Amino acid sequence: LNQVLNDNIRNGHVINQLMEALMQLSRQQFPTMPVDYKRSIQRGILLLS
Amino acid sequence: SILKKLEDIKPEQAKAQTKLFRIFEPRQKPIYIANGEKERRNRIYWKLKKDTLPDGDYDVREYFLNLYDQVLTEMPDYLLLKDMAVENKNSRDAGKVVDSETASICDAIFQDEETEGAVARFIAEMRQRVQADRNVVNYPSILHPIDYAFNEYFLQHQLVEPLNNDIIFNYIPERIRNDVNYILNMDRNLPSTARYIRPNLLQDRLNLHDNFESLWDTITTSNYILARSVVPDLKELVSTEAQIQKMSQDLQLEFLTGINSQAANDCFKTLIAAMLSQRTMSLDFVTTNYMSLISGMWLLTVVPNDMFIRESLVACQLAIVNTIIYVAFGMQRMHYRNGDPQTPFQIAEQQIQNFQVANWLHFVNNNYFRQVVIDGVLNQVLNDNIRNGHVINQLMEALMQLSRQQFPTMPVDYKRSIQRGILLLSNRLGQLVDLTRLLAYSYETLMACVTMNMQHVQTLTTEKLQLTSVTSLCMLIGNATVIPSPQTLFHYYNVNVNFHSNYNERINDAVAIITAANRLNLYQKKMKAIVEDFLKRLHIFDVAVAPDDQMYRLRDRLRLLPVEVRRLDIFNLILMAMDQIERASDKIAQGVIIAYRDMQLERDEMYGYVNIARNLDGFQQINLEELMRTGSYAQITNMLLNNQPVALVGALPFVTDSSVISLIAILDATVFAQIVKLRKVDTLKPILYKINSDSNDFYLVANYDWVPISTTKVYKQVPVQFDFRNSMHMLTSNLTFTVYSDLLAFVSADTVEPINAVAFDNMRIMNEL
Amino acid sequence: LIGNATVIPSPQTLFHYYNVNVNFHSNYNERINDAVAIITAANRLNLYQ
């Protein structure tokens, strides 16, 4: 008996989905948030993307 | 600091090919008859000039990539043919040849007692024919067909172009010649035969304005430094002490800190440079300094919103509104939360009732740049209401309304101080109008001298600028106009075009190398080295900072762009003839064939009795590259153990044995045991049989007249025979032409009279007479 | 900070881990067998203390 991961993550494909979602969040409006905090958040998101 | 780094760029050097790029050279070799004896007359064949190719097909492809890189790096831009000429001593028509080695070959062939007379007479008949009426000359040359094709391709795609005075007259960007305030002059002619090099004027293809903010910010910082270096200084400033005492008298005190000429000059240069290079700036000011607030309000009136960080813009707007605007009409002060998509000025526009102030706020809200494409260069242009400076009046009227309301819910002294500040700013209306018109004209004229696409995207590093300098500039400007010096403008333009050409050239080189590497099925090369070379050669970065991840992302971005035509055709030519170059080498073979059946050997006029298999049909093909890559040995071991035919294709070093003892005593198949025993095929050394009269063991094949029979053959192709009548060619070139670089030094410009300067609308720039 | 360095477990390390795990499993099974045999034999032979 063994516990194994799903095939989709095994070949390294979910990272593309994560990158696309992060890039979608990058150009988002991000309303009702201060300037520097939002800028830092989206630039860190871009860094990880 | 970085000024030297960004100003020490010289145009990319055009190599002058001292000799034709050679891979093949003639070599004299002995021959044998079909029986196997010396002919006592040698023949000359083709051999590689360089024999540094290592074994292993992957290393072969690596060597090919290096060869392509060397060829492209040693590309000839302009190819002279009169310089490379040595007089032949044997041409009875006193001709001249292309290369010194060509002369040596001609002398060798002309003097060899074993050679006939027809070839000698053909050698003696060589002579260059010059036709100067159409500027074309012909030269003789001897090359392998690959070399001749490469030389022809280099010859027929030179980058020169005929030069005339009107061409340089049109080489200047249009938005300089078209204006009247600048006049061009020459002092020398140009011949009809001179040539020059056009730089590259193609826009960005890496999209460095998007999702690459690090290098983009670095480039923006460099260009901002350059612009600060180039923007002209101010002349004829009013005396500081007199202005200070006059303002003090005007204010009736019983503030003014930060008013010096250096501050005004730094503010002017920094503002113009930041506007030019799209480097965003951040502000800073004490909230309890009303005059600073009004000066910043003027600054926001002229410069649009998009060039300011949201933090600084929000702070400045909040201070302005809640210190003057709602204070005027006595309405409840607004609490603008830091982070709403709306701006304080937008809310103020939606709130107040009076006409002029609302109109001015509405103007400052939505005043955005316009993207305009001129002469193939994208640029940012202010609204036409800003260049003629009429909008300033639409400012002042609103400010004038601010002096009429009673200012309820405020003490008298606060109203008095605000009225003093607004009056001091108002009395200098003409100075502000002249300064704004001067700024508009200077920005337009200078910005019309850039040749790279620009985008309005905020970057990471932000410029620091205090408003006290702006107040000093607004209070200290005088009457003398300032026009950028033509010499400085031309120097800036030369530096900018040099930078752009360097960038484009490096881009094309990297694209060509990567395309060739990925088309030659290379997959065991860490590709960060090429990107590091590119970044270093751009001569603005240090590879010690940018990590590898961005290099790989840049590579993936770069793969998409189609490569330039010349390099694509060069790669096509170098790949189409890959097999002939690879096989003709006399250091590596192309595989080993094993059959375990009695087969006869071939007879060639360059090796005598040699064991060679011209084709590989009728056997199972196994790749040595895969054999080493995957480490498997299953199929090959089972095929060899059961003694069945096998064929191997791949690079292998060879050992030459020329003993008939080795021929009779089978030893050409005993070099396969190590494959099973050692289970590694890196050093597989097949034995190459060879029988001839030189080895003093050929009497065996002569006395008993037996046909040699072996069990192995080596995948090697006999080199092609050399014929002098075919390698001869008549290369085509140009007679003589002086290559010109640094062309703009031949044009000089004179400043117009500073008073009579005309900016854009048939009117004088400054008018405070 | 992840670079472009491929790192697979070394074959000798893999065999070391496999041998250690199987040795531990064998010891666990044999000790379980001895304990259950001892208790069962003691219970069948009427050794209640």
mmCIF file of N, CA and C in Angstrom, chain B residues 617-719:
data_model
loop_
_atom_site.group_PDB
_atom_site.id
_atom_site.type_symbol
_atom_site.label_atom_id
_atom_site.label_comp_id
_atom_site.label_asym_id
_atom_site.label_seq_id
_atom_site.Cartn_x
_atom_site.Cartn_y
_atom_site.Cartn_z
ATOM 1 N N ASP B 617 23.445 0.198 -46.025
ATOM 2 C CA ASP B 617 22.174 -0.479 -46.238
ATOM 3 C C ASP B 617 22.295 -1.966 -45.925
ATOM 4 N N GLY B 618 21.192 -2.543 -45.455
ATOM 5 C CA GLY B 618 21.139 -3.962 -45.173
ATOM 6 C C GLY B 618 21.562 -4.372 -43.782
ATOM 7 N N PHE B 619 21.575 -3.451 -42.822
ATOM 8 C CA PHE B 619 21.967 -3.766 -41.457
ATOM 9 C C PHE B 619 21.116 -2.952 -40.493
ATOM 10 N N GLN B 620 21.212 -3.294 -39.211
ATOM 11 C CA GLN B 620 20.476 -2.599 -38.161
ATOM 12 C C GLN B 620 21.309 -1.426 -37.661
ATOM 13 N N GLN B 621 20.731 -0.228 -37.698
ATOM 14 C CA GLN B 621 21.440 0.984 -37.306
ATOM 15 C C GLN B 621 21.181 1.280 -35.833
ATOM 16 N N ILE B 622 22.257 1.387 -35.057
ATOM 17 C CA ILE B 622 22.196 1.716 -33.638
ATOM 18 C C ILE B 622 23.001 2.987 -33.417
ATOM 19 N N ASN B 623 22.426 3.933 -32.682
ATOM 20 C CA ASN B 623 23.057 5.227 -32.454
ATOM 21 C C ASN B 623 23.993 5.143 -31.254
ATOM 22 N N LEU B 624 25.258 5.517 -31.461
ATOM 23 C CA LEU B 624 26.196 5.587 -30.346
ATOM 24 C C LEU B 624 25.853 6.725 -29.395
ATOM 25 N N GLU B 625 25.339 7.840 -29.923
ATOM 26 C CA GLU B 625 24.942 8.951 -29.063
ATOM 27 C C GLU B 625 23.918 8.500 -28.032
ATOM 28 N N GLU B 626 22.870 7.806 -28.482
ATOM 29 C CA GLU B 626 21.882 7.273 -27.550
ATOM 30 C C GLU B 626 22.500 6.225 -26.637
ATOM 31 N N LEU B 627 23.413 5.412 -27.174
ATOM 32 C CA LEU B 627 24.046 4.373 -26.370
ATOM 33 C C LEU B 627 24.765 4.971 -25.169
ATOM 34 N N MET B 628 25.473 6.081 -25.372
ATOM 35 C CA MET B 628 26.129 6.742 -24.250
ATOM 36 C C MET B 628 25.137 7.527 -23.398
ATOM 37 N N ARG B 629 24.118 8.120 -24.022
ATOM 38 C CA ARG B 629 23.206 8.999 -23.297
ATOM 39 C C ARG B 629 22.353 8.226 -22.299
ATOM 40 N N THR B 630 21.742 7.127 -22.736
ATOM 41 C CA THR B 630 20.846 6.376 -21.868
ATOM 42 C C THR B 630 21.557 5.311 -21.046
ATOM 43 N N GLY B 631 22.796 4.968 -21.387
ATOM 44 C CA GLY B 631 23.530 3.970 -20.641
ATOM 45 C C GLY B 631 23.073 2.544 -20.842
ATOM 46 N N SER B 632 22.140 2.294 -21.756
ATOM 47 C CA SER B 632 21.667 0.938 -21.987
ATOM 48 C C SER B 632 22.654 0.157 -22.846
ATOM 49 N N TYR B 633 22.691 -1.160 -22.625
ATOM 50 C CA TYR B 633 23.510 -2.047 -23.443
ATOM 51 C C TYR B 633 22.792 -3.357 -23.749
ATOM 52 N N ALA B 634 21.462 -3.379 -23.674
ATOM 53 C CA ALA B 634 20.731 -4.637 -23.788
ATOM 54 C C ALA B 634 20.761 -5.168 -25.217
ATOM 55 N N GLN B 635 20.239 -4.388 -26.166
ATOM 56 C CA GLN B 635 20.087 -4.880 -27.532
ATOM 57 C C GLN B 635 21.435 -5.211 -28.158
ATOM 58 N N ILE B 636 22.429 -4.341 -27.965
ATOM 59 C CA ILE B 636 23.727 -4.543 -28.602
ATOM 60 C C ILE B 636 24.399 -5.802 -28.068
ATOM 61 N N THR B 637 24.332 -6.023 -26.753
ATOM 62 C CA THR B 637 24.982 -7.188 -26.162
ATOM 63 C C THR B 637 24.369 -8.483 -26.678
ATOM 64 N N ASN B 638 23.036 -8.547 -26.723
ATOM 65 C CA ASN B 638 22.374 -9.749 -27.216
ATOM 66 C C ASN B 638 22.618 -9.956 -28.704
ATOM 67 N N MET B 639 22.690 -8.872 -29.478
ATOM 68 C CA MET B 639 22.984 -9.009 -30.901
ATOM 69 C C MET B 639 24.403 -9.516 -31.133
ATOM 70 N N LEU B 640 25.369 -9.025 -30.354
ATOM 71 C CA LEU B 640 26.756 -9.423 -30.575
ATOM 72 C C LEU B 640 27.038 -10.823 -30.042
ATOM 73 N N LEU B 641 26.414 -11.204 -28.922
ATOM 74 C CA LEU B 641 26.713 -12.502 -28.324
ATOM 75 C C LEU B 641 26.298 -13.642 -29.245
ATOM 76 N N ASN B 642 25.132 -13.527 -29.873
ATOM 77 C CA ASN B 642 24.638 -14.563 -30.769
ATOM 78 C C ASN B 642 25.268 -14.497 -32.155
ATOM 79 N N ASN B 643 26.252 -13.617 -32.352
ATOM 80 C CA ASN B 643 27.013 -13.523 -33.596
ATOM 81 C C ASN B 643 26.096 -13.229 -34.785
ATOM 82 N N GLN B 644 25.466 -12.057 -34.733
ATOM 83 C CA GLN B 644 24.560 -11.612 -35.777
ATOM 84 C C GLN B 644 24.994 -10.248 -36.303
ATOM 85 N N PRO B 645 24.679 -9.929 -37.559
ATOM 86 C CA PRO B 645 25.159 -8.670 -38.142
ATOM 87 C C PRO B 645 24.658 -7.461 -37.369
ATOM 88 N N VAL B 646 25.541 -6.473 -37.216
ATOM 89 C CA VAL B 646 25.226 -5.232 -36.522
ATOM 90 C C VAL B 646 25.894 -4.077 -37.252
ATOM 91 N N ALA B 647 25.307 -2.891 -37.113
ATOM 92 C CA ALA B 647 25.874 -1.671 -37.678
ATOM 93 C C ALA B 647 25.796 -0.572 -36.632
ATOM 94 N N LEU B 648 26.904 0.133 -36.432
ATOM 95 C CA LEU B 648 26.979 1.242 -35.493
ATOM 96 C C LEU B 648 27.324 2.515 -36.252
ATOM 97 N N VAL B 649 26.593 3.589 -35.969
ATOM 98 C CA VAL B 649 26.830 4.896 -36.572
ATOM 99 C C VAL B 649 27.203 5.871 -35.465
ATOM 100 N N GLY B 650 28.330 6.545 -35.630
ATOM 101 C CA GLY B 650 28.781 7.506 -34.644
ATOM 102 C C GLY B 650 30.253 7.804 -34.804
ATOM 103 N N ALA B 651 30.693 8.824 -34.076
ATOM 104 C CA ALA B 651 32.079 9.261 -34.147
ATOM 105 C C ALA B 651 32.978 8.336 -33.340
ATOM 106 N N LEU B 652 34.104 7.948 -33.941
ATOM 107 C CA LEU B 652 35.067 7.073 -33.301
ATOM 108 C C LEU B 652 36.471 7.423 -33.772
ATOM 109 N N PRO B 653 37.425 7.599 -32.862
ATOM 110 C CA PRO B 653 38.828 7.692 -33.278
ATOM 111 C C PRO B 653 39.312 6.366 -33.845
ATOM 112 N N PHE B 654 40.269 6.457 -34.763
ATOM 113 C CA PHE B 654 40.776 5.294 -35.474
ATOM 114 C C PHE B 654 42.261 5.109 -35.201
ATOM 115 N N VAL B 655 42.694 3.852 -35.210
ATOM 116 C CA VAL B 655 44.104 3.498 -35.109
ATOM 117 C C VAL B 655 44.506 2.837 -36.420
ATOM 118 N N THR B 656 45.552 3.361 -37.049
ATOM 119 C CA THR B 656 45.990 2.875 -38.349
ATOM 120 C C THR B 656 47.038 1.783 -38.177
ATOM 121 N N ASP B 657 46.774 0.622 -38.770
ATOM 122 C CA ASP B 657 47.706 -0.495 -38.774
ATOM 123 C C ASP B 657 47.972 -0.894 -40.216
ATOM 124 N N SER B 658 49.247 -0.921 -40.597
ATOM 125 C CA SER B 658 49.612 -1.207 -41.978
ATOM 126 C C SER B 658 50.501 -2.438 -42.070
ATOM 127 N N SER B 659 50.146 -3.500 -41.354
ATOM 128 C CA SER B 659 50.903 -4.743 -41.371
ATOM 129 C C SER B 659 50.031 -5.857 -41.930
ATOM 130 N N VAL B 660 50.542 -6.555 -42.947
ATOM 131 C CA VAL B 660 49.824 -7.697 -43.496
ATOM 132 C C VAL B 660 49.748 -8.829 -42.484
ATOM 133 N N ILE B 661 50.650 -8.845 -41.500
ATOM 134 C CA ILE B 661 50.546 -9.809 -40.408
ATOM 135 C C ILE B 661 49.243 -9.597 -39.651
ATOM 136 N N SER B 662 48.917 -8.335 -39.362
ATOM 137 C CA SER B 662 47.634 -8.028 -38.742
ATOM 138 C C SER B 662 46.474 -8.367 -39.666
ATOM 139 N N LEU B 663 46.688 -8.298 -40.981
ATOM 140 C CA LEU B 663 45.623 -8.645 -41.914
ATOM 141 C C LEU B 663 45.316 -10.137 -41.869
ATOM 142 N N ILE B 664 46.351 -10.977 -41.952
ATOM 143 C CA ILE B 664 46.128 -12.419 -41.972
ATOM 144 C C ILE B 664 45.666 -12.908 -40.603
ATOM 145 N N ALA B 665 46.311 -12.437 -39.537
ATOM 146 C CA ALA B 665 45.913 -12.796 -38.178
ATOM 147 C C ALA B 665 44.839 -11.814 -37.738
ATOM 148 N N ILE B 666 43.586 -12.270 -37.739
ATOM 149 C CA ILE B 666 42.436 -11.396 -37.540
ATOM 150 C C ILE B 666 42.557 -10.652 -36.217
ATOM 151 N N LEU B 667 42.695 -9.329 -36.297
ATOM 152 C CA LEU B 667 42.763 -8.485 -35.112
ATOM 153 C C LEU B 667 41.920 -7.226 -35.266
ATOM 154 N N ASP B 668 41.125 -7.122 -36.326
ATOM 155 C CA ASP B 668 40.260 -5.974 -36.549
ATOM 156 C C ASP B 668 38.892 -6.134 -35.905
ATOM 157 N N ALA B 669 38.617 -7.282 -35.286
ATOM 158 C CA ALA B 669 37.349 -7.519 -34.618
ATOM 159 C C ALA B 669 37.488 -7.758 -33.122
ATOM 160 N N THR B 670 38.710 -7.829 -32.600
ATOM 161 C CA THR B 670 38.931 -8.097 -31.185
ATOM 162 C C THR B 670 38.865 -6.846 -30.323
ATOM 163 N N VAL B 671 38.327 -5.745 -30.841
ATOM 164 C CA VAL B 671 38.242 -4.508 -30.073
ATOM 165 C C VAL B 671 36.791 -4.274 -29.677
ATOM 166 N N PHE B 672 36.023 -5.357 -29.570
ATOM 167 C CA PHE B 672 34.637 -5.289 -29.134
ATOM 168 C C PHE B 672 34.397 -5.977 -27.801
ATOM 169 N N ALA B 673 35.384 -6.706 -27.278
ATOM 170 C CA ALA B 673 35.206 -7.389 -26.001
ATOM 171 C C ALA B 673 35.052 -6.395 -24.859
ATOM 172 N N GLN B 674 35.748 -5.259 -24.940
ATOM 173 C CA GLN B 674 35.672 -4.266 -23.875
ATOM 174 C C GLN B 674 34.283 -3.660 -23.752
ATOM 175 N N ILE B 675 33.485 -3.690 -24.821
ATOM 176 C CA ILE B 675 32.119 -3.179 -24.743
ATOM 177 C C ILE B 675 31.306 -3.998 -23.752
ATOM 178 N N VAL B 676 31.422 -5.323 -23.825
ATOM 179 C CA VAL B 676 30.740 -6.177 -22.857
ATOM 180 C C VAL B 676 31.425 -6.096 -21.499
ATOM 181 N N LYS B 677 32.755 -6.217 -21.481
ATOM 182 C CA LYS B 677 33.474 -6.330 -20.216
ATOM 183 C C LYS B 677 33.445 -5.021 -19.433
ATOM 184 N N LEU B 678 33.759 -3.905 -20.090
ATOM 185 C CA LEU B 678 33.814 -2.622 -19.400
ATOM 186 C C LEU B 678 32.493 -1.869 -19.430
ATOM 187 N N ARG B 679 31.579 -2.241 -20.326
ATOM 188 C CA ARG B 679 30.244 -1.646 -20.396
ATOM 189 C C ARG B 679 30.312 -0.126 -20.548
ATOM 190 N N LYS B 680 31.240 0.337 -21.382
ATOM 191 C CA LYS B 680 31.405 1.758 -21.656
ATOM 192 C C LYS B 680 32.034 1.908 -23.031
ATOM 193 N N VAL B 681 31.442 2.755 -23.869
ATOM 194 C CA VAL B 681 31.857 2.855 -25.264
ATOM 195 C C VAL B 681 32.432 4.234 -25.554
ATOM 196 N N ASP B 682 33.047 4.855 -24.547
ATOM 197 C CA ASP B 682 33.639 6.171 -24.750
ATOM 198 C C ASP B 682 34.958 6.101 -25.511
ATOM 199 N N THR B 683 35.740 5.040 -25.311
ATOM 200 C CA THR B 683 37.066 4.919 -25.901
ATOM 201 C C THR B 683 37.148 3.797 -26.932
ATOM 202 N N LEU B 684 36.036 3.473 -27.586
ATOM 203 C CA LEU B 684 36.044 2.440 -28.614
ATOM 204 C C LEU B 684 36.971 2.845 -29.751
ATOM 205 N N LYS B 685 37.996 2.026 -30.001
ATOM 206 C CA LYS B 685 39.040 2.324 -30.981
ATOM 207 C C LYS B 685 39.082 1.230 -32.039
ATOM 208 N N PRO B 686 38.305 1.358 -33.111
ATOM 209 C CA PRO B 686 38.398 0.386 -34.202
ATOM 210 C C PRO B 686 39.736 0.476 -34.913
ATOM 211 N N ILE B 687 40.168 -0.657 -35.458
ATOM 212 C CA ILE B 687 41.442 -0.759 -36.162
ATOM 213 C C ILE B 687 41.187 -0.613 -37.655
ATOM 214 N N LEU B 688 41.938 0.277 -38.298
ATOM 215 C CA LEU B 688 41.782 0.570 -39.719
ATOM 216 C C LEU B 688 42.837 -0.206 -40.499
ATOM 217 N N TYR B 689 42.398 -1.195 -41.271
ATOM 218 C CA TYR B 689 43.314 -1.949 -42.115
ATOM 219 C C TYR B 689 43.807 -1.092 -43.275
ATOM 220 N N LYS B 690 45.048 -1.339 -43.687
ATOM 221 C CA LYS B 690 45.645 -0.583 -44.785
ATOM 222 C C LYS B 690 46.842 -1.361 -45.307
ATOM 223 N N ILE B 691 46.844 -1.665 -46.602
ATOM 224 C CA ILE B 691 47.906 -2.440 -47.231
ATOM 225 C C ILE B 691 48.437 -1.658 -48.422
ATOM 226 N N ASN B 692 49.756 -1.488 -48.481
ATOM 227 C CA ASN B 692 50.397 -0.787 -49.586
ATOM 228 C C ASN B 692 51.875 -1.157 -49.601
ATOM 229 N N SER B 693 52.591 -0.636 -50.599
ATOM 230 C CA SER B 693 54.001 -0.969 -50.765
ATOM 231 C C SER B 693 54.897 -0.273 -49.751
ATOM 232 N N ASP B 694 54.418 0.796 -49.112
ATOM 233 C CA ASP B 694 55.257 1.539 -48.179
ATOM 234 C C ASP B 694 55.608 0.714 -46.949
ATOM 235 N N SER B 695 54.761 -0.246 -46.587
ATOM 236 C CA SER B 695 54.890 -0.945 -45.316
ATOM 237 C C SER B 695 55.891 -2.091 -45.349
ATOM 238 N N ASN B 696 56.507 -2.367 -46.498
ATOM 239 C CA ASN B 696 57.512 -3.421 -46.651
ATOM 240 C C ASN B 696 56.958 -4.804 -46.316
ATOM 241 N N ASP B 697 55.633 -4.951 -46.308
ATOM 242 C CA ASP B 697 54.994 -6.242 -46.096
ATOM 243 C C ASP B 697 54.030 -6.589 -47.222
ATOM 244 N N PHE B 698 54.088 -5.869 -48.340
ATOM 245 C CA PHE B 698 53.178 -6.081 -49.457
ATOM 246 C C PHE B 698 53.591 -7.239 -50.354
ATOM 247 N N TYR B 699 54.773 -7.823 -50.142
ATOM 248 C CA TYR B 699 55.205 -8.933 -50.986
ATOM 249 C C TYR B 699 54.282 -10.135 -50.844
ATOM 250 N N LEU B 700 53.593 -10.249 -49.707
ATOM 251 C CA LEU B 700 52.634 -11.332 -49.524
ATOM 252 C C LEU B 700 51.512 -11.242 -50.549
ATOM 253 N N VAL B 701 50.983 -10.036 -50.768
ATOM 254 C CA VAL B 701 49.881 -9.873 -51.710
ATOM 255 C C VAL B 701 50.355 -9.930 -53.155
ATOM 256 N N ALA B 702 51.660 -9.823 -53.396
ATOM 257 C CA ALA B 702 52.184 -9.860 -54.753
ATOM 258 C C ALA B 702 52.582 -11.264 -55.187
ATOM 259 N N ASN B 703 53.277 -12.005 -54.324
ATOM 260 C CA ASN B 703 53.754 -13.332 -54.702
ATOM 261 C C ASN B 703 52.590 -14.294 -54.910
ATOM 262 N N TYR B 704 51.683 -14.369 -53.940
ATOM 263 C CA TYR B 704 50.577 -15.315 -53.984
ATOM 264 C C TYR B 704 49.303 -14.723 -54.573
ATOM 265 N N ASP B 705 49.310 -13.434 -54.909
ATOM 266 C CA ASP B 705 48.210 -12.734 -55.582
ATOM 267 C C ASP B 705 46.844 -13.153 -55.038
ATOM 268 N N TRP B 706 46.643 -12.891 -53.750
ATOM 269 C CA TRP B 706 45.384 -13.192 -53.087
ATOM 270 C C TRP B 706 44.619 -11.903 -52.828
ATOM 271 N N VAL B 707 43.295 -12.002 -52.816
ATOM 272 C CA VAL B 707 42.425 -10.863 -52.542
ATOM 273 C C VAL B 707 42.203 -10.796 -51.033
ATOM 274 N N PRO B 708 42.573 -9.702 -50.370
ATOM 275 C CA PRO B 708 42.400 -9.628 -48.915
ATOM 276 C C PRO B 708 40.937 -9.754 -48.520
ATOM 277 N N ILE B 709 40.694 -10.506 -47.450
ATOM 278 C CA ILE B 709 39.352 -10.734 -46.930
ATOM 279 C C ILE B 709 39.369 -10.469 -45.433
ATOM 280 N N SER B 710 38.441 -9.636 -44.968
ATOM 281 C CA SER B 710 38.339 -9.326 -43.550
ATOM 282 C C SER B 710 36.908 -9.503 -43.065
ATOM 283 N N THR B 711 36.645 -9.119 -41.818
ATOM 284 C CA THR B 711 35.315 -9.226 -41.241
ATOM 285 C C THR B 711 34.757 -7.893 -40.768
ATOM 286 N N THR B 712 35.510 -6.805 -40.897
ATOM 287 C CA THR B 712 35.067 -5.493 -40.451
ATOM 288 C C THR B 712 35.374 -4.454 -41.519
ATOM 289 N N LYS B 713 34.566 -3.398 -41.529
ATOM 290 C CA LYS B 713 34.794 -2.245 -42.385
ATOM 291 C C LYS B 713 34.537 -0.982 -41.580
ATOM 292 N N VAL B 714 35.197 0.102 -41.977
ATOM 293 C CA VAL B 714 35.131 1.372 -41.266
ATOM 294 C C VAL B 714 34.368 2.375 -42.117
ATOM 295 N N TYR B 715 33.419 3.069 -41.492
ATOM 296 C CA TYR B 715 32.564 4.033 -42.180
ATOM 297 C C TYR B 715 33.356 5.318 -42.389
ATOM 298 N N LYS B 716 34.158 5.340 -43.451
ATOM 299 C CA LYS B 716 34.936 6.512 -43.826
ATOM 300 C C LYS B 716 34.839 6.706 -45.330
ATOM 301 N N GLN B 717 34.704 7.957 -45.756
ATOM 302 C CA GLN B 717 34.580 8.290 -47.168
ATOM 303 C C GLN B 717 35.902 8.841 -47.686
ATOM 304 N N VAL B 718 36.345 8.322 -48.828
ATOM 305 C CA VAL B 718 37.596 8.800 -49.425
ATOM 306 C C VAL B 718 37.439 10.263 -49.810
ATOM 307 N N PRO B 719 38.407 11.130 -49.510
ATOM 308 C CA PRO B 719 38.262 12.546 -49.864
ATOM 309 C C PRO B 719 38.171 12.741 -51.370
#
